[PDB]
Amino acid sequence: WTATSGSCKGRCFELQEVGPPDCRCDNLCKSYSSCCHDFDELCLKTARGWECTKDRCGEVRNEENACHCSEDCLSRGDCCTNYQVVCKGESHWVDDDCEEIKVPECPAGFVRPPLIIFSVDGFRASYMKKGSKVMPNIEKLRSCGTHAPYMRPVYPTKTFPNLYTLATGLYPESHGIVGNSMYDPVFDASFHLRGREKFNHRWWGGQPLWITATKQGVRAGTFFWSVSIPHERRILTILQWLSLPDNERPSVYAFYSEQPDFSGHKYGPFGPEMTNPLREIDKTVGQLMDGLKQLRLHRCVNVIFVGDHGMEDVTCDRTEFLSNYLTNVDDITLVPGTLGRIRAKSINNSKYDPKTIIAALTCKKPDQHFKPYMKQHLPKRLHYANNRRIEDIHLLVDRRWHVARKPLDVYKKCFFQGDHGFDNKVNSMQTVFVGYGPTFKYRTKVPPFENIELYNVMCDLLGLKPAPNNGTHGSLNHLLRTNTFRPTMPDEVSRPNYPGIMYLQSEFDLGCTCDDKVENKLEELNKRLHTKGSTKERHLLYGRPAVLYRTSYDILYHTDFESGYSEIFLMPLWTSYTISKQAEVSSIPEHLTNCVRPDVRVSPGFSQNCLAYKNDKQMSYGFLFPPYLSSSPEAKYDAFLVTNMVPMYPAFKRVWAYFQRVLVKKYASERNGVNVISGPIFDYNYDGLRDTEDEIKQYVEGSSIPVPTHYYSIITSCLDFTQPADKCDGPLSVSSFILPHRPDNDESCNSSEDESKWVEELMKMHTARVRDIEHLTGLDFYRKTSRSYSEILTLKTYLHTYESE
Ligand SMILES: *[C@@H]1O[C@H](CO)[C@@H](O[C@@H]2O[C@H](CO)[C@@H](O[C@@H]3O[C@H](CO[C@H]4O[C@H](CO)[C@@H](O)[C@H](O[C@H]5O[C@H](CO)[C@@H](O)[C@H](O)[C@@H]5O[C@H]5O[C@H](CO)[C@@H](O)[C@H](O)[C@@H]5O)[C@@H]4O)[C@@H](O)[C@H](O[C@H]4O[C@H](CO)[C@@H](O)[C@H](O)[C@@H]4O[C@H]4O[C@H](CO)[C@@H](O)[C@H](O)[C@@H]4O)[C@@H]3O)[C@H](O)[C@H]2NC(C)=O)[C@H](O)[C@H]1NC(C)=O
Ligand SMILES: Cc1nnn(Cc2cc(C(F)(F)F)ccc2OCc2n[nH]c(=O)n2C)n1
Ligand SMILES: [Ca+2]
Ligand SMILES: [Cl-]
Ligand SMILES: [K+]
Ligand code: NA
Ligand SMILES: [Zn+2]
């Protein structure tokens, strides 16, 4: 209840929200059923429309008008945005040449350039090129400012998760807005786009930009606009707030447009009906820039033009139905559409089995347009698991498709021709970024980057300290003229040990054998220098990784590879090697098929043993440095050290062996050498972060050898591929992956075929950023390079996507 018989006189779009049951005149009042009686009349004026005409010039102020063309309007801050153009012979901002903004050119009393975020729903990245003829104001922002070819949204590529990610720098799993609809079992409450529960603060985690600003003494305009407030009025309100006195005026503002998403759902991303919504958004941009230029703020304000996600062609006839797969379809609740989320209809039924539901959805039809996953098996790059609101069963839906429970769900609910929500690597889901202003660079193109990075930059733009977030602060410094954040490398926590030869062969009782006893001061001094780190400059190109947590580990040198070996986990944390373009692939000789050799630098007590692998009927083993790539028959013995061994399911050894035998060599040939760092990952609680030893849920049977949940590799070479990986003078090029360590290959529907038909496809699906691997391992890579740290940070955030151009 609100006693709505107070007044909005003098309060129109008040910045501080007053508490019920006093009536409201702030933006949001419409959405709460709480506007004062006279809100529409006073605050939502429309008389005479939105543009000055020649006859209105110097008119007698009529307070009823939407905007004014009277002489006093400039000092009142309430002119129509085109006032000076019609009545003072001024040009539109878009018709002016662009001129570099070297320093902020701001009115007196401005303590810092304001930030205006112009956010557009459903604005697919390719609209920038494809709609360029109808979007002159946007194209000027884009070519005169700083722009990326596209910006990667977060998964799911829905509206609410992406806008809140923009505001917080957090993955949806951390901020809690994990979809457009959600169930929270601890609350026992549901969140929906329609309705009232969405207004409860307990859904909304992290710290959004407006709260960060406020807590730090920077004033913020509203980020949420009521849908009934038209766009012209949102602009005029921002422009009015910008005319407030210094002590009252916000420093950060947001505009939001429901377009082009609204029309995109109806007509598809490139429907002929899409041209008009793009023209209209551009006109709104035009209104802002003309308005700012009137207030002499157009070389003062930083403007960000940013989308939440793109839009794909999706129709009713491209719907897979769970009823075509399951028989107990009534025992389930599906969150449907461009992603699937499945849970039990009743918490009272313990006859519901997630395992049988998954198997019933796995590889059942030759062209099947979705893939079921337990959430913890989703690609780690999605970061979509560590929240009680994300259901255990997830369906990743092919682009252009929907999933629904029963056919009745579609026809009793073709309307739609466009949708979004798919895997955030998909080209059609990409969206836009442009920055324009004194703090951004002039006429600069930057590489594509992820929307999680922007919060840090917006904080830098406003002189704020960002709350803890998932951005990598410094990785977007290259967007900025000034205001950069000078990041420093994290301090190493654990220094390595460098063991020499300390154990006799007979001290080991590991149950391992090797056919290796065959007996030279040329080649004895040779192996010696190799075990002290002589070829280490070849195999460790960027310094050793730093260990950022407290642990016990040894650096081990070898002719062909170097490793950091963990006495705690009994295996390397990392193994580093370089494979030149010229390198030869050889086979594992027959006599060495089952060879595992004691490492005389490492105690029996800190070594693995072969007996555990014999006894464990499910678990086998692989090697981190591949025997196939040894530089010599003699160097090959190093690859069979017990210290290079890691536990591997036979089903996973198929994947790993193909990567090591075929793909490493393919990459070296293509990229002119590669440096590879590979290792295990333990993430049993699927939080994206390195497990402590007490979190490990699985060991090789009857041993203390922990089983990894994943294996990673980071594959680096010269960006100028005319230079070999081992002698690169400039910027680097990287691709990485985090492969799930699974006892079956149920994920790959074509896995009974040759590895050449499926393995690389799997690896591509599990592409990763170096930064993802850092979180998962507590390691810090690229410590010793000739590149600036900001550049390295950008490299660590790079994702190799495997989408076409
Ligand atoms: C992306 O960036 C983010 C932000 O940096 C990273 O997330 C952080 O990770 C930290 C480590 O996981 C985590 O720190 C823990 O926080 C606990 C207190 O947390 C509250 O306070 C903060 C700060 O104001 C707040 O942000 C939190 O908000 C969460 O919870 C509410 C709902 O309750 C949500 O509204 C909100 O969205 C958010 O949810 C998300 O995080 C939680 C976990 O906190 C998940 O459960 C959700 O799924 C969701 O993703 C909180 O309100 C604190 O209690 C922890 O301390 C324990 O662990 C330490 C180890 O140092 C130990 O020493 C202590 O003893 C203690 O253990 C005790 O509790 C245990 C569990 O109950 C119990 O087992 C023990 O026996 C002990 O009793 C811990 O410090 C930090 O909160 C989050 N922050 C956010 C915002 O998510 C994220 O990791 C990044 N991702 C990647 C991939 O890098
Ligand atoms: C979800 C969600 N999370 N954060 N927001 C606020 C918000 C943030 C931005 C930002 F951060 F990119 F700048 C832009 C626009 C925003 O809201 C627009 C809006 N008005 N009305 C309405 O329904 N919406 C969604 N919305
Ligand atoms: Ca973990
Ligand atoms: Cl959703
Ligand atoms: K075995
Ligand atoms: Na399979
Ligand atoms: Zn939409």
Side-chain angles (χ1 to χ4, degrees), residues 671-731:
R671 309 173 46 177
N672 185 11
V674 291
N675 173 258
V676 183
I677 304 172
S678 295
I681 278 161
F682 310 83
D683 193 20
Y684 279 98
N685 61 349
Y686 52 88
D687 70 351
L689 305 172
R690 174 195 57 96
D691 291 355
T692 48
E693 0 162 2
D694 65 6
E695 290 168 327
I696 304 306
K697 296 169 70 52
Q698 194 188 334
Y699 291 85
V700 178
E701 194 184 314
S703 78
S704 269
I705 309 172
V707 171
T709 54
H710 298 83
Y711 285 99
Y712 74 86
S713 300
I714 298 175
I715 301 178
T716 314
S717 59
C718 204
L719 185 65
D720 179 7
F721 64 103
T722 69
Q723 301 188 311
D726 67 340
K727 279 177 214 64
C728 175
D729 292 306

Side-chain angles (χ1 to χ4, degrees), residues 396-412 414-423:
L396 271 191
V397 177
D398 285 10
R399 69 190 78 189
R400 297 159 54 80
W401 289 74
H402 275 172
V403 65
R405 197 170 67 99
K406 296 191 283 205
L408 73 92
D409 291 345
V410 181
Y411 67 75
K412 281 247 266 196
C414 187
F415 333 96
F416 57 88
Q417 283 178 277
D419 208 354
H420 53 84
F422 304 104
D423 190 335

